[PDB]
Amino acid sequence: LVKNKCVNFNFNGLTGTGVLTESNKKFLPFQQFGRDIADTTDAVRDPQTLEILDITPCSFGGVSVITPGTNTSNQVAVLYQDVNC
């Protein structure tokens, strides 16, 4: 198991892509993975060590270019629209 970086994963056949992290969720002993209000997986129980993991996506939206206008200058700034640098 590797955590805090984007990976493909498969736990016991439950398959996906995302950043796995340690979790505060408390599954009952028979429950094996968790879902949100939109019915998509967001948590999983590790089959080896029975600890709870969160899942989070890897797809992060716009890149936007900020310009003085080319009449004024050719230098620019760039916005990564939802990213922690």
């Binding site: 939109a38 019915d39 998509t40």
Partner: protein
Amino acid sequence: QKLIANQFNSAIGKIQDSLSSALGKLQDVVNQNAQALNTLVKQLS
């Protein structure tokens, strides 16, 4: 002037009680936009 000021000061107190006891026009815009999004997500399956 004193009567008119008292009526005004009294009337503001009623607004505060009414709001602390609705905003349906705003709330149902938020609800409509959440419904459209959850419906978009449901269409994937």
